[PDB]
Design a protein around this nucleic acid. Structure first.
Ligand code: MG
Length: 1566
RNA sequence: ACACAGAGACGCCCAG
RNA sequence: CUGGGCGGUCUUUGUGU
RNA sequence: ACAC
RNA sequence: CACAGA
């Protein structure tokens, strides 16, 4: 630990060098903490020190024993003194010794230790310590130290003799170290250990006396005093709590904390559970008696075959037992008409008779065509002339007709649902309605799907390159890519245009246009017998539409002449059409609002799929080949999932992951993928579902027969024999892993019908009927064979003690006294305005409890800011002032008063719980306490987001350190089932009260007791229909149970008669107690870790195995990693058997804590582990790129045309950092461009040609023009970078220069006319002169509110914010946004800071002749603060502009790699908000002295020269009228750095290296 | 056609 | 069985990061 | 965008 | 004047 040795390995070159910083974790094991006795005297602070326990943990050599004194005047820096002693031997120096005198007042600063080497270099080191657990605090301290001295050093680096100076920073915390100096892990560990000692000393010293610390600010002192008074004076009426809520005796907590654990009971139970787990292992894995590996695999195959046949036979008995069907998976025709110019060519004039005698559809279509040919055509094709007139100078006219249909044709239509409510009592309708409820047989003949998936023609070229829609897209793309004109861009554009002419994309284009037509026509209405006829705009296809109500189905039938169908998609998966002579017709299918999204997004989805799988198979995006049939299978499967769009199919595909991860299990265990048949049964309703289930069962038996081969080709580990789960084709690991996520193409945002809420209610109440009768094992005593909800007190206390051990070992032996202070501070500092959010709250009370009184009323939810505004207007400012009344209200009730709804997710059947105001207020405090406690835990990853990347990676270094090279790693990924609903809440209350300072005990106990009488409100329409029918007659038991409970036949415990709600005592809810559940899981993991370590220490037969144990856990996911080191091949088998036994008993020990292990746990896999959808295959971290690629169209509604590109950029960056190469990301962006122009009206509006030809001359964002990125850096740089680079090459800054000098001498479209927002503002009653009031008192924008009026102004400003502006937007963004493409370029929709887009383009072009000058740098800074790094990066990317390179045999070492591409420039050291507030008001917000800040103030003056010390005079000089935008721009000017993390080989050279490598995998660009 | 181990939707409101 | 109306229409969006 |  | 910094 020597400063000379530290400095002797610094490669100083040229003048000042500022080497890149780096981070060190707490990787190595640390010994015990020595004894510390502290007595603080007026003479000084006297400390005695024991001795560090000597072991094979040499860490702790710098600590010496004996008595140490510290003076009282210097006792406020014990942390900084004691940590860095030993690196201090020659005192402190000034900026005068080795540096000259520049006569500026900066001569005199003392930078810790200044050292000059024998060569003559000068290296200055600076030290800092921080008590901040997150890495943000270390980053902040590092930055403030590196900005305190950089100017005084770069000032004198020019006077002296051609200097070579290095500036060094070392920042030390309890967690880690951030230093830009070279350093060793051991040096880091030593510094952190010393800091732990020093902080313990400081805490003990500051405890006894009270003058050691310096002065806390008045705001902090007030906050702590306020919270402490609240917790001293809070009395929650424990007698009433015991009377009201069940199992709420405080005696339970007292006895839990007083009675110790029963160690004899613990060890006896541990022996019993080990024996039971060993017996289960031998029985279920056929280990005894004495069979070989193939002889056991041959039995495993037989068992899997038996289970599969049993499941098939079970499902077949509940079907209609049919073996052939006539359904089709794709409900759309296979037509591929050639796109041509537009004219209504129906006048075949011979088809008007051949249609008339072909059936009901023939009659309908003949009537329609005859009426159109006789009559007018308005509505069928939109009129350009009148629309152009209205644009230059929104009810839309549609063509409606009433055919004279007969009763036979009407009945035949109604069989398909067209007007089937008035025909629902006939014979055929009732028969078909009964027959629609049956499920298919597992033995149905689905081979058309099997042939289609391999032998289609989806990827064939359609030869439709030179058509209208292709020409439009190509024109816009070339204009967008004109500025970055290079051979690279030309190659990628040519590849995209090749993919745009394939058969599937040509199909998806007209499918998407039809879906957009339906989305627009959803909101119309028709009378009885009315229909709507439409043409399809570049395609000769006619559609008849029957809308009902826009919240229900819409029916459509398609018609095309046979001469126009040039080509067809081949296959037998399509529904069959009607031949009517010269026409083809279709039989009235239907759609909904929620099922239109996939059809709108289909062309872009198919384009992305083609590009992605071509990249994954190794085909470069500039070569032309033939499809390899694996490409066909993957793309066809994507197609079929997208078009079918059903939850069951998505769920059958998703489960393949858990059956195929079972092939990584190593000996002595067998792969058992047959445990996933528990989730596989259920009703089958489509042929595609039958096919997928059969393929999945084949995959299961194949995996059970043979595991994945593990071969050491280099020392790195690679697996062989992998395959696609559905196709069965052999592949590699990455393609197999990505194949598990194909089901994510199904539309997540799915409408739930009222038919399917019983499943959610069933999942909620399935455990309540199981609650134990006696409360003995709910916290009082010990049991060894626990029931469903019970747990053992001794084991709970053992786990708590173990986690406390680890907490003390990391944070020192006074962690509780620091935790108390942190919790008091964070409770006292909060106000109501922090709570007031845009979030739903329940109105359910004791007025909606009786369905007799409810029927006429309609239940609605409110938003949280309404109730919070009520509180603020009452006279409540602080959260402490609100909890006291919220709890009293809750205790006056006896309920929790929840309402429910369903979540949209790619998972299962997740339900959502919504609370009310008082419940939210009470829960806030306990959640903040639990979060503060979880932030200390060293293996929890909810309060520590870096630990989910740190632990797994550092395990290898720790194992190498403690065992040497060549060690076997053995893992276990664990998942928990019924996580919520398995937890009784007394458990969480006890575990949280174990870790808290005993003044919070009563509040925590009373706050958590209220979860034991919940009342959840069911849906009123569901209740109406359930009350309509007295008897249930259903085969599912839950239906009749609910009916009889609500009507009073039987008695269940969760529903009363005539009520509107469901009661439940057991179980927490999903997400309400996130941190408490995480803390409990951390305690359990710590118990397992100590247990495994002790077991390894006393190995088999008494000999000791040497090993390393690592654990990690979140909320319900966890992982265990063990590394062993055996001596010989005889020892290896027995050590691995011992480890397998150790990892197998987790599922047997879990029930003791109230946790149940799921069937999705992959136990005993050697060189792999998965924790949170991240798959660590030895040294080949894999992510599923397909998950984020399938979500690159989920845009937001936005408000301005120029904020759509920001959303597209966010999605693109997600895709790139998910593991996509730059060329792939550029192709994804081409697809996003097509999506943007389609929502702007490409396939709807007739005037898009004129608008596009008039925009291609004036390429401006916010007039709809799309800006493309550079292919070499596709996703790295954002929209601001693209705008900056576009204003400097084409005529945009020219336009901006017109707009600038006209100011010195943005085209919003509203969606609802702000009706809901305006009504929300009307109920609040806020002052409308708030702008004037904050103009006359500006302290509200920088200083936290201090009275009711200022808090009112704070809220009033908050509720006019851009964030609050768009939150009343409901779901299904794509249909609602694409519906407005009908009235976009021709109606008065924009209010520029109303007119149509054509009109605004005309105004801008009329100003295009007065355009003057290009942009100037001084205000280029004002528009773009980061305008220097932009030029540096733009200049770096011009070396790569061609398509020359070589294919290299790729190395396989994949890791996250952070890239900083835009840094922070050299401005005033602080933030502008901080500095301005500091000078303008009395607020010590910035961290500089009194003589300081004058330099920063004068340097800030250079940018403006009008800014002054007075806010009032400052306001009247600048170009800003009001402080409300003054503050906005002050926050804006502080520029933000952009950083991106990547996937690739470990690594301004970084930018060039990633540009070279990650253009295409295995290709070295230039 | 959608939803569902048969709980729903297939238009609603007003005036005649 | 005639006429007139029906959109940011609610369903619908919880806790954390 | 991820989890619960 | 210069120090330390949840
Ligand atoms: Mg897991």
């Amino acid at each position: 630990m020597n400063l000379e040795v530290l400095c002797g390995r610094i490669n100083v070159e040229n003048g000042l060098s500022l080497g890149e910083p780096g981070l060190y974790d707490q990787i190595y094991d640390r010994p015990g903490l020595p004894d510390l006795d502290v007595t603080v005297d007026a003479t000084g602070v006297t400390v005695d020190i024991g001795a560090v326990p000597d072991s094979a943990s040499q860490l702790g050599s710098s600590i010496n024993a004996g008595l140490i004194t510290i003076q009282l005047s210097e006792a406020y820096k014990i942390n900084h003194d004691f940590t860095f002693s030993g690196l201090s031997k020659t005192t402190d120096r000034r900026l005068s010794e080795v540096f000259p005198i520049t006569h500026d007042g900066s001569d005199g600063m003392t930078p810790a230790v200044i050292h000059t080497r024998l060569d003559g270099t000068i290296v200055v080191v600076e030290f800092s310590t921080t008590r901040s657990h997150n890495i943000g605090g270390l980053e902040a301290a590092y930055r403030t130290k590196i900005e305190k001295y950089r100017d005084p050093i770069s000032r004198r680096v020019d006077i002296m003799e051609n200097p070579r100076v290095f500036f060094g920073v070392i920042v030390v915390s309890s967690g880690g170290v951030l230093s830009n100096m070279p350093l060793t892990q051991d040096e880091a560990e030593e510094l952190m250990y010393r800091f732990c000692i020093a902080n313990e000393i400081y805490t003990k010293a500051r405890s006894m006396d009270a003058d050691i610390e310096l002065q806390k600010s008045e705001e902090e002192l007030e906050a702590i005093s306020r919270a402490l008074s609240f917790f001293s004076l809070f009395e929650p009426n424990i007698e009433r709590v015991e009377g009201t809520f069940p199992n709420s005796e405080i005696k339970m907590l007292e006895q839990f904390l007083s009675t110790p654990a029963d160690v004899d009971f613990i060890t006896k139970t541990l022996k019993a559970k080990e024996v039971e787990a060993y017996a289960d292992l031998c029985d279920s894995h056929y280990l005894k008696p004495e069979k070989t590996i193939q002889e056991r695999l041959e039995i495993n195959r037989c068992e899997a075959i038996d289970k599969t046949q049993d499941l098939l036979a079970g499902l077949h008995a509940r079907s209609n037992k049919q073996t052939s069907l006539n359904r089709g998976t794709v409900k759309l025709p296979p037509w591929l008409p050639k796109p041509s110019s537009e004219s209504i060519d129906i006048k075949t004039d011979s088809g008007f008779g051949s249609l008339m005698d072909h059936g009901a559809y023939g009659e309908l279509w003949a009537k329609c065509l005859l009426d159109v040919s006789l009559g007018n055509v308005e509505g069928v094709v939109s009129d350009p002339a009148k629309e152009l007139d209205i644009a230059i100078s929104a009810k839309i006219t549609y063509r409606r007709f009433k055919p004279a249909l007969s009763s036979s044709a009407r009945q035949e239509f109604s069989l398909q649902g067209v007007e089937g409510k008035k025909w629902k009592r006939m014979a055929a309708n009732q028969k078909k309605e009964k027959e629609s409820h049956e499920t298919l047989s597992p033995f149905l003949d689905v081979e058309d799907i099997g042939d289609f998936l391999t032998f289609n023609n989806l990827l064939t070229d359609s030869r439709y390159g030179d058509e209208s829609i292709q020409r439009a897209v190509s024109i816009l793309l070339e204009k967008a890519s004109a500025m970055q004109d290079t051979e690279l861009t030309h190659a990628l554009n040519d590849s995209f245009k090749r993919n745009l002419s394939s058969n599937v994309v040509q199909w998806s284009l007209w499918v998407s246009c039809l879906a957009q037509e339906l989305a627009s026509a959803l909101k119309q209405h028709c009378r009885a017998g009315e229909f709507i006829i439409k043409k399809l705009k570049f395609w000769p296809i006619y559609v008849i539409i029957k809308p009902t109500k826009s919240s229900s189905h819409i029916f459509y039938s398609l018609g095309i002449r046979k001469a126009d169908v040039t080509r067809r998609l081949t296959g037998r998966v399509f529904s069959d059409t009607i031949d009517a002579g010269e026409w083809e017709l279709t039989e009235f299918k239907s759609l909904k609002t929620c099922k239109l999204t996939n059809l709108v997004n289909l062309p872009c989805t198919m384009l992305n799929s083609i590009a992605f799988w071509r990249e994954k198979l190794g085909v470069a995006p500039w070569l032309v080949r033939k499809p390899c049939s694996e490409l066909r299978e993957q793309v066809g499967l994507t197609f079929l999932i997208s078009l079918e769009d059903k939850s069951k199919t998505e769920e059958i595909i998703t489960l393949t992951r858990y059956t195929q991860m079972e092939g990584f299990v190593s000996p002595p265990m067998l792969p058992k993928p047959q445990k996933m048949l528990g989730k596989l049964d259920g009703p089958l309703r489509t042929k595609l579902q039958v096919y997928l289930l059969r393929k999945h069962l084949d995959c299961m038996v194949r995996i059970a027969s043979q595991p994945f081969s593990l071969i050491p080709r280099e020392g790195r580990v690679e697996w062989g024999g992998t395959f696609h789960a559905i196709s069965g084709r052999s592949t590699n690991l990455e393609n197999m892993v990505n194949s598990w996520y194909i089901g994510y193409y199904k539309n997540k945002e799915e409408s739930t019908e009222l038919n399917a809420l019983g499943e959610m209610y069933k999942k909620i109440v399935e455990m309540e009927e199981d609650k134990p009768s006696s409360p003995e094992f709910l916290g009082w005593g010990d049991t060894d064979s626990p029931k469903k909800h019970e747990f053992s007190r001794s084991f709970l206390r053992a786990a708590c003690s173990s986690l406390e051990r680890e907490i003390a070992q990391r944070h020192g032996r006074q962690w509780k006294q620091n935790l108390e202070e942190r919790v008091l501070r964070e409770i006292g500092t909060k106000n109501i305005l922090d709570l007031a959010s845009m979030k739903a709250t329940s109105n359910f009370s004791k007025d909606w409890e009786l369905y007799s009184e409810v029927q006429t009323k309609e239940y609605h939810r409110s938003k949280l800011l309404e109730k919070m505004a009520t509180l603020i207007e009452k006279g409540v400012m602080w959260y402490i002032d609100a909890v006291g009344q919220a709890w009293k209200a809750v205790l006056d009730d006896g309920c929790m008063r929840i309402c429910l709804f369903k979540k949209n997710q790619h998972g299962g059947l997740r339900e959502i719980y919504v609370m009310d105001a008082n419940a939210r207020l009470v829960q806030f405090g306990v959640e903040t306490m639990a979060r503060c406690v979880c932030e200390l835990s060293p293996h929890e990853t909810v309060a520590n987001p870096r630990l989910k990347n740190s632990i797994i990676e550092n395990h290898g270094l720790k194992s190498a350190r403690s065992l040497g090279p060549g060690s076997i790693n053995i893992n276990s990924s664990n998942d928990a089932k019924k996580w919520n609903q398995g937890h009784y809440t007394t458990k969480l209350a006890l575990v949280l009260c174990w870790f808290m300072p005993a003044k919070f005990h009563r509040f925590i106990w009373a706050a958590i007791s209220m979860f034991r009488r919940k009342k959840m409100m069911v849906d009123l329409r569901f209740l109406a229909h359930l009350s309509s029918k007295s008897e249930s007659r259903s085969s599912d038991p839950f239906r009749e149970a609910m009916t009889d409970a609500f009507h009073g036949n039987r008695d269940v415990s969760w529903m009363d008669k005539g009520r509107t709600y469901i009661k439940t005592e057991t179980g927490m809810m999903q997400g309400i107690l996130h941190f408490t559940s995480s803390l409990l899981h951390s305690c359990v993991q710590s118990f397992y870790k100590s247990y495994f370590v002790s077991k390894l220490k006393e190995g088999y037969m008494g000999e000791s195995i040497s090993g390393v144990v690592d654990v990690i856990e979140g909320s319900d996911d966890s992982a265990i990693m063990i590394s062993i080191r055996p001596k010989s091949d005889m020892d290896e088998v027995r050590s691995r058997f011992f480890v397998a036994n150790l990892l197998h008993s987790v599922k047997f020990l879990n029930p003791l804590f109230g946790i149940y292990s799921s069937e999705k746990s992959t136990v005993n896999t050697v060189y792999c582990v998965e924790y949170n959808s991240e798959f660590h295959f030895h040294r080949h971290l894999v992510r599923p790129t397909l998950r984020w690629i399938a979500a690159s169209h989920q845009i937001s509604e936005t408000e301005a045309l120029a904020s759509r590109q920001e959303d597209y950029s966010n999605l693109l960056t997600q895709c790139l950092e998910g593991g996509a190469s730059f060329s792939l990301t550029y192709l994804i962006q081409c697809a996003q461009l097509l999506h943007h122009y389609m929502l702007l009206g490409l396939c709807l509006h007739p005037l898009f040609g004129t608008f596009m030809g008039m925009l291609i001359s004036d390429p401006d964002p916010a007039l709809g023009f799309f800006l493309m990125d550079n292919p070499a850096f596709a996703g790295g740089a954002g929209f601001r970078f693209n705008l900056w680079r576009a204003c400097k090459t084409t005529d945009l800054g020219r336009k901006y220069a017109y707009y600038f000098n006209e100011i010195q001498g943005s085209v919003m479209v509203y969606w609802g006319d702000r009706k809901k927002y305006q009504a929300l503002l009307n109920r609040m009653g806020l002052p409308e002169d708030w702008v004037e009031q904050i103009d006359e008192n500006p302290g509200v924008l920088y200083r936290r509110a201090a009275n009711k009026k200022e808090l009112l102004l704070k809220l009033a400003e908050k509720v006019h914010s851009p964030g609050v502006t768009s939150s009343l937007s409901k779901g299904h963004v794509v249909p609602r946004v694409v519906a407005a493409g009908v009235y976009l370029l021709s109606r008065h929709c924009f209010r520029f800071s109303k007119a149509s887009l054509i009109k605004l383009l005309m105004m801008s072009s009329i100003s295009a002749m007065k355009h003057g000058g290009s942009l100037n740098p001084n205000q280029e800074r004002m528009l773009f603060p980061q305008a220097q790094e932009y030029d540096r990066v733009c200049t770096l990317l011009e070396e790569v502009e061609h398509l020359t390179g070589k294919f290299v045999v790729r190395e396989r070492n994949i890791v996250r790699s952070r890239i900083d591409l835009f840094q922070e420039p050299v401005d005033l050291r602080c933030k502008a908000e901080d500095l301005v507030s500091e000078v303008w008001f009395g607020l010590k917000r910035t961290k500089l002295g009194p003589r300081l800040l004058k330099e920063e103030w004068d340097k800030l003056r250079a940018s403006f020269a009008w800014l002054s010390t007075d806010p009032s005079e400052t306001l009247r000089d600048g170009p800003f009228l009001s402080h409300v935008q003054f503050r906005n721009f002050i926050a804006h000017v502080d520029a933000k750095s952009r950083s991106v993390r990547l996937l690739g080989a470990p690594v301004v050279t970084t930018i060039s290296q990633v540009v070279r490598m990650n253009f295409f995998p295995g290709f070295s660009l230039e």
